[PDB]
């Protein structure tokens, strides 16, 4: 009934949104960290190939390794440029818009939780509208609803209550007066009228919106209404704008999965950096046909498909560095070494050996 | 008077904080971008040094360039590691804690703003308590108070209303009944008692805290009380914990200002990477003596002090590269991927020279 406390059907979907928004900074940390890790993997491969080229300087395979090193080094450079120009803004914006909306929701939900008179009369009721609910640890009436921003640790980005379409649990409500409102719990936050709601001497002078514009509290003796937020469209200046802002920002995330961060499977001449290097440094001529690039590539990779690239990479990975550069009982094969700084110092040594 | 609408002295300092927390995401973008920029500058110097070494293969200056290239590559590596492990967590946590707290405040302020019965009676009153306030543009009562998360572009955030000590404007209140409450404006959000406040059939069963634990609304006919937040100490499980968390996270930011992102200025032997490489590659003796290291360095830098490091970097920057690979001096070129493609060409020719 109008002007009564809100049963769990009304506030549980808000808890679920709040708990999912809680994970957005965890996903931002995940993605920022993954971008760096994938740049670092690209850089490690560029360094392994560079070390192989320096150790084998002069051979046809060393020239292949230079092509490989250039490939992965260009990949690492582009990934850092993408972290700087694109992912940083995406992830800060999604963190900020989601955390702000979560604050708007939690302050409303926290008000309902506390605005009660008894164990059976209040603004926040259980599923059947029998008992007012209590917070117990992270749960409210058995519902995960921390009403807090949890400590931020990396968590894979997940989209359940906030998806590409919108807030999938916040549908058009068919019957708020029976599905949202209790039958007898008293709650002055359910209307702006003075008899049973927020008004003192008379009704509030207008409808009041709560939870960043989601619920509209009429100043008449009528049930609340809610925005349908499950099929959003871009807009400005809406009363529920923080909902749109967070939806727009989460939908915009690519994660660390754009081409900078992924390995290429294509033929060798189609791989980043390769053909420009062949034309300028090996063929030493422009306007060379595709057959000429493939023939020159065969000199260094035995072929021009992805399988021959992989074969060169395996040679790089099995190549050992000197035992004194990597611990004592430590691995020496390049493929068993990782870490940019560590491989950087090893490259420097072999580069100095080449200088002599 | 108790149980009445809130004059501007109550909510204005909350506007001040909300407006400043709006800046914290801008500062996170600024720092994440600055760190990546500084890494990129380190890498460019690594690449210029490496290209110089390739073109000048065999000379003592080329070996100095190898030492220089190792230095900057290590600095670039460490910066990306710091970005990943430390700066990202710092700036995501500050963005989130500030934005969350700002949402908690803005919902409460937006609720007071709307809960009114007339232009003279409501929950959000002006300075003198004569009229309820209205939001006009980005101000409420003449005070910046947008109650929005504004678009994010990089900017250093102000640290005026939330600083190292806490929230300067959220002081111990000497007289809430008269400084925070009007005497006649009606506002059911001002108490939990049933006659004038949130209670219907009787008072609420306990006090209610609002704005993430800042204001406590008694279930009796008494004035509100507020937390003093201007001298915070680290704590957990507090009713006002979101205030503590945003304060802790802002205080903890280093920026892109740690040793990974700054250039070194002392002698060559103490510079990142130098002595290990000299010992391993040139002296062929680990744990060598200062004198030995510095004698060996003199053969390539013509000295062992920062001024000779700078001199080699000038030589690196003046080295020309082929016009068709691109301004042709290495110091006139910037951009990691671009300098990478150039290093690749010269390395391919080094292989051909055999």
């Amino acid at each position, epitope marked *: 009934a109008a002007e009564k406390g809100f049963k769990q059907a009304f506030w549980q979907p808000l808890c679920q949104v709040s708990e999912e928004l809680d994970d957005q900074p965890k996903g931002a940390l995940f993605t920022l960290q993954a971008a760096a890790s994938k740049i670092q993997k690209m850089r490690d491969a560029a360094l392994r190939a560079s070390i192989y080229a320096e150790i084998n300087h002069g051979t046809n395979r060393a020239k292949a390794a230079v092509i490989v090193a250039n490939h992965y080094a260009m990949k690492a450079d582009s990934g850092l440029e993408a972290l700087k120009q694109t992912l940083s803004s995406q992830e800060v914006t999604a963190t900020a818009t989601a955390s702000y909306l979560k604050g708007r929701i939690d302050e409303y939900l926290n008000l309902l939780l506390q605005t009660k008179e008894s164990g059976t009369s209040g603004c926040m009721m259980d599923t059947s509208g029998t008992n007012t609910v209590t917070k117990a640890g992270g749960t409210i009436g058995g519902v995960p609803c921390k009403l807090q921003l949890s400590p931020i640790q990396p968590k894979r980005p997940a989209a359940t209550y906030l998806g590409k379409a919108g807030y999938v649990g916040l549908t058009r409500q068919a019957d708020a007066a029976n599905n949202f409102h209790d039958n007898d719990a008293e709650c002055r936050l359910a209307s702006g009228h003075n008899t049973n709601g927020l008004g003192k001497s008379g009704q509030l002078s207008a409808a009041v919106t709560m939870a960043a514009g989601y619920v509209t509290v009429a100043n008449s003796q009528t049930a609340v209404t809610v925005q349908a937020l499950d099929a959003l469209q871009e807009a400005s200046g809406a009363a529920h704008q923080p909902w749109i802002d967070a939806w727009k920002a989460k939908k915009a995330l690519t994660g660390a999965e754009t081409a900078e961060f992924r390995n290429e499977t294509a033929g060798i001449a189609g791989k980043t950096g390769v053909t420009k290097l062949v034309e300028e440094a090996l063929l030493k001529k422009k306007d060379s046909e595709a057959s000429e690039i493939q023939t020159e590539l065969k000199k260094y990779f035995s072929g021009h498909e992805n399988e021959q690239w992989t074969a060169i990479e395996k040679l790089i990975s099995e190549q050992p560095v000197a035992q004194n550069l990597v*611990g004592d009982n430590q691995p020496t094969k390049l493929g068993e070494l990782e*870490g940019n*700084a*560590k491989l950087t*110092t090893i490259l420097a040594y072999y580069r100095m050996e080449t200088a002599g | 008077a108790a149980e009445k609408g809130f004059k501007q002295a109550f909510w204005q300092p909350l506007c001040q904080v909300s407006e400043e927390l709006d800046d914290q995401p801008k500062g996170a973008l600024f720092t994440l971008q600055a760190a990546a920029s500084k890494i990129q500058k380190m890498r460019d110097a690594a690449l210029r040094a490496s290209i110089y070494a390739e073109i000048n293969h065999g000379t003592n200056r080329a070996k100095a360039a190898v030492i220089v290239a190792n230095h900057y590559a*290590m*600095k670039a590596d*460490s910066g990306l*590691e*710091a970005l990943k*492990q*430390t700066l990202s967590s710092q700036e995501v946590t500050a963005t989130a804690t500030a934005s969350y707290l700002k949402g908690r405040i803005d919902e409460y302020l937006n609720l007071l703003l709307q809960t009114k019965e007339s232009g003279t009676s409501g929950c959000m009153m002006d300075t003198s308590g004569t009229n309820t306030v209205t939001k006009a543009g980005g101000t409420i009562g003449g005070v910046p108070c947008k109650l929005q998360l504004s678009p994010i572009q990089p900017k250093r955030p102000a640290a005026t209303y939330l600083g190292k000590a806490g929230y300067v404007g959220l002081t111990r209140q000497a007289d809430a009944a008269n400084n925070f409450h009007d005497n006649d404006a009606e506002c059911r959000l001002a108490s939990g008692h049933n006659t004038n406040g949130l209670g219907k059939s009787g008072q609420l069963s306990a006090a209610v805290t609002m704005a993430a634990g800042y204001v406590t609304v008694a279930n009796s006919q008494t004035a509100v009380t507020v937390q003093a937040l201007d001298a915070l100490q680290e704590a957990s499980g507090a009713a006002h914990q979101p205030w503590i968390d945003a304060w802790k996270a802002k*205080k*903890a930011l*280093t920026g892109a200002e*740690t*040793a*990974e992102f700054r250039n070194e200025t*002392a*002698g060559i*032997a*103490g510079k*990142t*990477g130098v*002595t*290990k490489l000299v*010992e391993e590659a040139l002296l062929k003796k*680990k*744990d*060598s*003596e*200062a004198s030995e*290291i510095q004698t060996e360095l003199k053969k390539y830098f013509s000295g062992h002090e920062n001024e000779q490091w700078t001199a080699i970097e000038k030589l690196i920057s003046e080295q020309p590269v082929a016009q068709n690979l691109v301004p042709t001096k290495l110091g006139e070129l910037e951009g990691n991927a671009k300098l990478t493609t150039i290093l690749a060409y010269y390395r391919m020719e080094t292989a051909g020279k055999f």
Partner: nanobody
Amino acid sequence: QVQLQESGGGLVQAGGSLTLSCAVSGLTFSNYAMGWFRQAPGKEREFVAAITWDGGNTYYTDSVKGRFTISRDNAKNTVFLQMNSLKPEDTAVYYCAAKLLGSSRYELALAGYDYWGQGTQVTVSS
């Protein structure tokens, strides 16, 4: 901000042990070599021990070699100095210090570091 915080010092009998701890905050601990220095009464500050950023090498001054053992726990952002067989001459204020990517005895004994702790007193009483 960056903070290096020493603990584990105080008063100990001659021939006893101390575990000095240095916790690092605000910094990517795994990027940093860590060193221990000490200032005994009426003497210049001296190098005690250090560990490279990757933990591959450790260095000691002659007077503590074999008696002290430096080690690091990257997961706890902490470097330790295990001091055994303590002597009155070991009485000193002990400082923790951090140097980016430190990798050689010369750097870690003689060159300048990036960050310093405030020190903690160790007293070896016979």
